[PDB]
Design a protein around this ligand. Structure first.
Ligand SMILES: O=C(O)[C@@H](CO)OP(=O)(O)O
Ligand SMILES: O=C(O)[C@@H](CO)OP(=O)(O)O
Ligand SMILES: [Mg+2]
Ligand SMILES: [Mg+2]
Ligand SMILES: [Mg+2]
Ligand SMILES: [Mg+2]
Lengths: 433, 432
């Protein structure tokens, strides 16, 4: 069982405080940290910050840390449960918080412990994390996902006009995970040259997720730059494009502002229909195979309409918030066909796995995801392999809070051997391999 | 002894290949990875790259990985040496490579092994890494360093015109290491605003080390921006500035080009004398307490003359390349008074610790440093504490290949409990 739990405040990849947990068992020390979003959906579980203006501009997480150290710790220690008992230990924390959105302790408190317990449970089972996660989820046949690399950053993640948040490349045609890394990196480096040649060296600094942040406004131009880099790198047959629009960030009184980082001017706002029409142009002009949050998190009608009119992957993020309640509604309304899985949107390992299995039982894909604010933690690498989802997005191949996950996936591939299967073109539904 | 060594290619913080090593002993698995510079001194130990123009644009490290898996691993394993024997194991590597500059296996191959050996050594001693390193170095005091945060990035490779490489803030007046992290992070976020209000949001994206990359040319403007943010954040009395000029990057024809990322034009060149007068202006007008690589790695006369005429810290980086032979010369010529310690400029833990002790025995400071291409490895956090140097630069408080080290230092401070001391105002000479 659990011997000791100790939380502390560390800094995330943007320099903001976040929760880290050390959990001790007779097998040793297990450590996890909690990521943090910037474009956070209104329905996400509560991320509890201190609000002390003279400390980290109000962003401290000492209250969450104290909840773990003073309340959650003795409760789990008192339970005497084995760390393999992920569901029972998570349920104890949810019940002890007692609120629907984890607002007593914060989702960041509960999740930090939940992650560390799962790492400790793996060790107790004497299994790599990915395999323990597979067992928790009832899977046997592990798969390496296609990585989705966010190589141009916009929206709330970069200092440019570009309103859409992420432009991703997916090496579906790679021979292996390790090969997908090579394709992704090579295109990223080629892209830096494309941008520099066109816009100058000052357009080649990076946004919060490691993607370049060129000084452009038009989303189609970001698409054109990524397509050119794929082609110049020689991978047109093998790499396709995905997007995270993050439309909730630029939703304004029922309309959408594709220039939301410039001073307010409602005369430029477009309707949901016009935005849809734009995406139709993107899908026909570029190799876009996936679009995340194309509309606002409460714009259910636009989602459903759009999803019914395309053949590509449509990904719920702010829409679904890794929350079975909202997923059920989306499935009933056919609002989308893929769940973005963010453990910190719901606040526990057990509920994230439940959310994944719910989507998968309904024919949806699932893409495991980082947050904009990450840490050196690599749990989600193991998570996407154990959940067998076939897709992960965890940054450009730049900034080590992103590479740390991609390196871990390469290590997991190596460990699995000639039993490593890569999702490739089955990234939406890899259970067929 | 060592049961198995297995090296692999991973990606560093810029998305370029680098060497990782997994070493197994009865105590378990010990992993380390090797960083990589961009503004690399001509005298640095050789970083071996594959140069296959078709694969990772020539930057693969399959050769170095092969050297470790095929050549080095079986030799060290056959040796039977305990992983506690850092010196013997490094020396065996040095002799197998057989070249002064590690040009046969690559310094990246030998360091990857050397670091993993060290981590495994600590575990055999049943000590935390930082304590093992202290024992290797013969140190008993420990001290948390003042962090130097690179919050405005410039130089060879900066998506701006700014010629000088790094503008750093140092929270010398902090109450602890963890307090120094809050002061740094708050000034960083204050600086983002300062920049955004003056230059617009497009100037607030980041360079390789997580510092802002504003579209400016004048080095004094970088300093003004930094000074404003310190003051706006309310920390004028507790934070000071350090600079890495990396002047070898802009040395041209016996002179210096402060606009080197612009199309060539000799007319704009200045002499080392004009450059030194610029620095004396910076020191007088800004709270600059440390300047690294103010002159070219071969311009010994400028280094010695400037060091003799200032009371600030003068740091050799490309001048000394963590190399005891170069340090000897710099000591004799009084070229600088602080060593920048980069384990990968020399290629082994043993030799880095020898370089640090040579510097310290001659009354110099030592600043442990990252490279601009880093990994999720946090070795240098344990290093700077065990060597007791009192100062570390390992990035802005942004990008987790930087934060991973700073967060490890917070952990080490927490582990030392009541026995924790912070170098603070005594960063230059914390042995007092
Ligand atoms: O909207 C998103 O998918 C995420 C992931 O990049 O960004 P954030 O963590 O800021 O919500
Ligand atoms: O010159 C330096 O001190 C370093 C700073 O991290 O840069 P690089 O590793 O590129 O040489
Ligand atoms: Mg978001
Ligand atoms: Mg999103
Ligand atoms: Mg350099
Ligand atoms: Mg330097």
């Amino acid at each position: 069982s659990i011997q000791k739990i100790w939380a502390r405040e560390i800094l995330d990849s943007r320099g903001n405080p976040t929760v880290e947990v050390d959990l001790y068992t007779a097998k040793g020390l297990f450590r996890a940290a909690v990521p943090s979003g910037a474009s956070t959906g209104i329905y996400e579980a509560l991320e509890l910050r201190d609000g002390d203006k003279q400390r980290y501009l109000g962003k401290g997480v000492l209250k969450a840390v104290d909840h773990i150290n003073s309340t959650i710790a003795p409760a789990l220690i008192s339970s005497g449960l084995s760390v393999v008992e992920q569901e029972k230990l998570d349920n104890l924390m949810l019940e002890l918080d007692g609120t629907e959105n984890k607002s007593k302790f914060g989702a960041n408190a509960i999740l930090g412990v939940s992650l560390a317990v799962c790492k400790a449970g793996a060790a107790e089972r004497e299994l790599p994390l990915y395999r323990h996660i597979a067992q928790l989820a009832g899977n046997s046949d592990l798969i390496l996902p296609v990585p989705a690399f966010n190589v141009i950053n916009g929206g709330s993640h970069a200092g440019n006009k570009l309103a859409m948040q992420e432009f991703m490349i997916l090496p579906v045609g790679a021979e292996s995970f390790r090969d997908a890394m090579r394709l992704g990196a090579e295109v990223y480096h080629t892209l830096k040259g494309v941008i520099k040649d066109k816009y100058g060296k000052d357009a080649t600094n990076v946004g919060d997720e490691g993607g370049f942040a060129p000084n452009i406004l038009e989303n189609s131009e970001a698409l054109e730059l990524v397509k050119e880099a794929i082609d110049k790198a020689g991978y047109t047959e093998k790499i396709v494009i995905g997007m995270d629009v993050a439309a909730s960030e630029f939703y304004r009184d029922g309309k959408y502002d594709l220039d939301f980082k410039s001073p307010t001017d409602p005369s430029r706002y477009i309707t949901g229909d016009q935005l849809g029409a734009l995406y139709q142009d993107f899908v026909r002009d570029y190799p876009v195979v996936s679009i995340e949050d194309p509309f606002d998190q409460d714009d259910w009608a636009a989602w459903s309409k759009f999803t019914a009119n395309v053949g590509i992957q449509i990904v719920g993020d702010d829409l679904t918030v890794t929350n079975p309640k909202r997923i059920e509604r989306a499935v009933e309304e056919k609002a989308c066909n893929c769940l973005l899985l963010k453990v910190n949107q719901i606040g526990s390992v057990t509920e994230a796995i439940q959310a994944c299995k719910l989507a998968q039982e309904n024919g949806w894909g699932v893409m495991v995801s980082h947050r904009s604010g990450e840490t050196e933690d690599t749990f989600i690498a193991d998570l996407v392999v154990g959940l067998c989802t076939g897709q992960i997005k965890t940054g450009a191949p730049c900034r080590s809070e992103r590479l740390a996950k991609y390196n871990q996936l390469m290590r997991i591939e190596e460990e699995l051997g000639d039993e490593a299967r890569f999702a490739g073109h089955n990234f939406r539904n890899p259970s067929v391999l």
